[PDB]
Design an enzyme around this catalytic site. Sequence first.
Site, PDB file in Angstrom:
ATOM      1  N   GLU A  36       0.784  -1.220   0.000  1.00  0.00           N
ATOM      2  CA  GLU A  36       0.000   0.000   0.000  1.00  0.00           C
ATOM      3  C   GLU A  36       0.826   1.284   0.000  1.00  0.00           C
ATOM      4  OE1 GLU A  36      -2.990   0.190  -0.581  1.00  0.00           O
ATOM      5  OE2 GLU A  36      -3.641  -1.876  -0.289  1.00  0.00           O
ATOM      6  N   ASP A  40      -6.090   6.619  -5.400  1.00  0.00           N
ATOM      7  CA  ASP A  40      -5.572   5.300  -5.548  1.00  0.00           C
ATOM      8  C   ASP A  40      -5.493   4.905  -7.029  1.00  0.00           C
ATOM      9  OD1 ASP A  40      -8.091   4.522  -6.162  1.00  0.00           O
ATOM     10  OD2 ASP A  40      -8.398   3.265  -4.359  1.00  0.00           O
TER      11      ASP A  40
END
Length: 164
Positions: free
Chosen positions: A11, A20
């Site tokens: 991540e 994202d």
Amino acid sequence: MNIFEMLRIDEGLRLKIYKDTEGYYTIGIGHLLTKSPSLNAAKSELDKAIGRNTNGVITKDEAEKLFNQDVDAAVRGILRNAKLKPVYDSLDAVRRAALINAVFQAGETGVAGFTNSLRMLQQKRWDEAAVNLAKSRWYNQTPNRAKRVITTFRTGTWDAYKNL
Ligand SMILES: [Cl-]
């Protein structure tokens, strides 16, 4: 290696709002703030999660708090999903981490279409499960991350993360 370092590798860490891979507002360590195209909607969600007026930035400590809350949420969603629980319980420690990683990635539990994969996992048909997991939008959209998780399910080792 453990679940936290694992996802921490997958991540990344960003202290200012960002989009994202899907173009969603996120911050910290994979912490999805919102799916709305509104920055304002994202800052509000951010202030509310943080408990203060952020202005879109947080400290490392704050990011890590969210992360801890998030991994905890994931494990607990798994424990509470009737289809996930049994799978999760049938697995070893390493593979359990891969299940947590994937569910975390979904921001939700028992996502659409992975019934067959789960079944193969549950039956310990590793190679077959790997192949099946790969026939997925997931794999096509984020093939590198998906490959690491898939390798983790198939082998039961941390090999895919040892070198990152
Ligand atoms: Cl990727």
